[PDB]
């Protein structure tokens, strides 16, 4: 019947309207941050604290197997290829000995971590791959250029 249909239309549910849409909302507060990733903090903290001077060089499209071979090669140089995912590298400065080394660790780059000032061994590592660019060496955890690294190394 038509008359019954009229009753249904009037009884139709009416939804309320929010004052502001979620996208156009005023700035709301956000939950406090949580460190999930926490394991990786310990590994990077140990290696950087152990090694005062770090030579930062961009990583060419190297193979995983070569890195182990290069890791053994550095053992002859008394240096260690210890690397981890870099998306946890940036928060390293947030929770570590220093907070100001973020600009040095920009992008994906090979890190040569050595605790001793064996300049010749570090220079030899540079000689291994010329095409691979060495960003620089933070001798005594002080920011420096590649040319400066050699100058201070002298």
């Amino acid at each position: 019947h038509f008359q019954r249909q009229k009753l249904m239309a009037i009884t139709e549910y009416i939804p309320p309207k929010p004052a502001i849409n979620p996208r156009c909302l005023p700035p709301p507060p956000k939950p406090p941050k949580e460190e999930s990733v926490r394991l990786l903090r310990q590994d990077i903290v140990a290696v950087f604290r152990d090694n005062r001077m770090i030579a930062v060089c961009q990583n060419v499209a190297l193979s995983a197997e070569d890195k182990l071979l290069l890791r053994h090669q550095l053992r002859k140089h008394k240096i260690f290829i210890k690397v981890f995912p870099s998306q946890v590298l940036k928060p390293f400065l947030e929770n570590s000995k220093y907070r100001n080394l973020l600009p040095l660790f920009v992008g994906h780059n090979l890190l040569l971590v050595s605790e001793e000032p064996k300049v010749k061994e570090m220079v030899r590592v540079l000689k291994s791959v010329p095409f691979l660019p060495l960003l620089g060496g933070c001798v005594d955890d002080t920011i420096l250029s590649r040319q400066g690294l050699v100058d201070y190394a002298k």
Partner: protein, 195 residues
């Protein structure tokens, strides 16, 4: 990351496969479902959104499809409805009447809803009545959504007030059952969005 869910506590009965349904044995379907409205063993099932008649072929379609696809190691299936008994004269076949909101098949085991969504939806499409695959979480959300819409309704006039108060003499043009349905059920069909 967070720990992954586990189904170790779940136990699969030996009779993983569905049992056979016999070919052969008045408002049975024109009303709200009063039986098999609660999850018994499994966390997933099929919920009838309308009143339909399930013949032997439908049971075989459910039985054959479920048995072939289900994994006995991690899945089990049970029947939530009786065998067909209502004759359809040409008798060509017999059917099982179903009411709106009846759970027809319930499956459980060490599986997620998404794994069974595709098969259950395919079975639901092949069913003679409108149906929707349901789970314990999804079913509660439907009720929670149903409650939320009812609670926040802004309509000054409601179906119950007009019907119970006999305003306009509406009860003269309404059936006795309509009072119980409250506008959510019409004939053999159920209106989920009617709040």
């Amino acid at each position: 990351l967070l720990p992954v869910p586990t189904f170790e506590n779940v136990s699969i009965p030996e009779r993983s496969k569905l049992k056979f349904v016999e070919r052969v044995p008045l408002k049975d379907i024109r009303g709200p479902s009063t039986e098999a409205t609660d999850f018994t063993e499994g966390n997933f099932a099929i919920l009838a959104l309308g009143g339909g008649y399930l013949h032997w072929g439908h049971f075989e379609m459910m039985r054959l499809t479920i048995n072939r696809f289900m994994d006995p190691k991690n899945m089990f299936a049970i029947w939530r409805v009786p065998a067909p008994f209502k004759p359809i004269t040409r008798i060509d076949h017999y059917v099982t009447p179903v009411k709106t909101g009846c759970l027809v098949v319930e499956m459980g085991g060490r599986c997620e809803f998404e794994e069974v969504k595709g098969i259950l939806n395919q079975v639901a499409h092949k069913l003679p009545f409108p149906a929707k695959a349901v789970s314990r979480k999804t079913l509660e959300r439907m009720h929670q959504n149903q409650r939320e819409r009812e609670l926040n309704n802004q309509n000054p006039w409601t179906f119950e007030h007009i019907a119970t108060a006999n305003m306009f003499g509406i009860r003269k043009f309404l059936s006795p059952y309509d009072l119980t349905q409250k506008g959510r059920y019409w004939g053999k069909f159920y209106m989920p969005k009617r709040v």
